Design an enzyme around this catalytic site. Structure first.
Site, short mmCIF file in Angstrom:
data_model
loop_
_atom_site.label_atom_id
_atom_site.label_comp_id
_atom_site.label_asym_id
_atom_site.label_seq_id
_atom_site.Cartn_x
_atom_site.Cartn_y
_atom_site.Cartn_z
N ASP A 1 0.85 -1.19 0.00
CA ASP A 1 0.00 0.00 0.00
C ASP A 1 0.89 1.25 0.00
O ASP A 1 1.43 1.64 1.03
CB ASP A 1 -0.94 0.02 1.21
CG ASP A 1 -1.99 -1.10 1.17
OD1 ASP A 1 -1.79 -2.12 0.48
OD2 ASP A 1 -3.02 -0.96 1.86
N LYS B 1 -6.95 3.35 -2.85
CA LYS B 1 -7.28 3.30 -1.43
C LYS B 1 -7.52 4.71 -0.90
O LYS B 1 -6.84 5.64 -1.32
CB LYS B 1 -6.14 2.61 -0.67
CG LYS B 1 -6.25 2.65 0.84
CD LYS B 1 -5.25 1.71 1.46
CE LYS B 1 -5.08 1.98 2.92
NZ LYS B 1 -4.04 1.13 3.55
N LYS C 1 -10.28 0.18 -1.85
CA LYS C 1 -10.04 -0.08 -0.43
C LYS C 1 -10.34 1.15 0.44
O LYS C 1 -9.48 2.02 0.62
CB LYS C 1 -8.59 -0.55 -0.21
CG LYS C 1 -8.23 -0.81 1.27
CD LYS C 1 -6.88 -1.52 1.44
CE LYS C 1 -6.42 -1.44 2.90
NZ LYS C 1 -5.18 -2.21 3.19
#
Lengths: 246, 246
Positions: A101, A165, A197
């Site tokens: 991430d 995300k 996400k």
């Protein structure tokens, strides 16, 4: 109500997260144990890179190969230094990460620099190829406007993001319904094989329902599986388990 | 002063070390700033792997690109898990390490297992190939006997170590003159391209002079340069500066 079905679905989509930066090996092993919950397995765990080898061993021992190991880079500041972001991502991959991430340089985008964001995601995608998936945190709470959130989402996807995300969890405003709608809309319009996400502040099944309902409305009931949707959360798991009676 | 000549020499061979594992970025930057001393640059700094990108930026920022960045793996326990040690070493390299200080599985050696130590050093060396030098910490304080200290040294060298290093600094007994003599003798007898690093407990120039004299006497006055000799220390720098009048 429909809250238990939502809780069950959310749990299977969780990136079970611990990012205190003061974890012990035992706490990492316990996190792996918890990811294997009485109500099923989470999609993944998310931890700092140096804990990946301990986690990999723990996950193998309990025979849960489908629980992936996610980690974070350029985190959480999202600075605009490409060499640093790249070195961290390469290290993460070398540690054995299944997923990285990466924090998008959102302040640079705000100041009008769209290039550094593209180049950073691109080189980090190259580094991940054949080893890991790349999630890109755009920090919608700091981007604020629908315009910038859309822009950042489009750039991230263009540059090779496997997921987009919302948040690092480390700023004032993290996941919001309105930010989620903009990002899911960009996914629908550009590439439905890019995942979403929502992360930070997802406390319980009610919150989870917000984002799953959005994904359902925008991309269809069947779209959000573990390869297209994750909840970035920590104490959410305990809540979901309680809703499910465990 | 003869001792000022020693303080100057030892300073240039220092791996200026901070391994609290709670360092801030500012503390890493401060460490780099200290490596650029009023009496010259140290040979290297030594920090945990995740700090390598920031340190690399800080050293370039202060225009000292030739101060090496060392780091540690399998540290400090020296467990016998090859997969863990390999992953950590690969990550250290990917972070941008110039040098990796690997802890040898000395407890395994003491238990009679020579192969795991050889294999660990070899794969970690291969992981460094073309990017970094490998230092191997044999933990002489725990090996204790001359036979074991000689054995660990020989194994490390045969498996490809660039340096052999006395100690982690984390056990009861660290660098000692007696352990140094054994290790330098193995180097002289087997491979003079392999460097030596006494670490832990070297408080001042007098301490420094002890190990430098051994190197000079055993391998020659010319042998001990930054490519063959390092001081693994922290507080030693402030002492040397006080000796040189800073």
């Amino acid at each position: 109500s429909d809250i238990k079905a939502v809780a069950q679905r959310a749990l299977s989509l969780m990136d079970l997260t611990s990012l205190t930066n003061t974890e012990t090996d035992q706490e990492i092993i316990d996190l792996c144990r918890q990811a294997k919950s009485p109500a099923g397995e989470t999609a993944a765990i998310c931890i700092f890179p140096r804990f990946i080898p301990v986690a990999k061993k723990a996950l193998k021992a309990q025979q849960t190969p489908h629980i992936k190991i996610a980690t974070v880079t350029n985190f959480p500041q999202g600075n605009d230094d490409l060499d640093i972001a790249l070195a961290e991502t390469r290290a993460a991959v070398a540690y054995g990460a299944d997923e990285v991430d990466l924090v998008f340089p959102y302040r640079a985008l705000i100041q009008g620099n769209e290039t550094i964001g593209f180049d950073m995601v691109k080189v980090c995608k190259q580094a991940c190829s054949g080893n890991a998936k790349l999630k890109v945190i755009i920090e919608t709470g700091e981007l604020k406007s629908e315009e910038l959130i859309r822009k950042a989402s489009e750039i991230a996807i263009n540059a090779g993001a496997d997921f987009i995300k919302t948040s690092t969890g480390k700023v004032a405003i993290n996941a919001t319904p309105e930010a989620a709608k903009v990002m899911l809309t960009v996914i629908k319009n550009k590439n439905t094989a890019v995942g979403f996400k929502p992360a930070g502040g997802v406390r319980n099944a009610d919150d989870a329902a917000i984002y799953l309902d959005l994904a359902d409305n925008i991309l269809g009931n069947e779209w959000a599986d573990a390869n297209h949707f994750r909840f970035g959360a920590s104490s959410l798991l305990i809540s979901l388990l309680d809703t499910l009676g465990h």
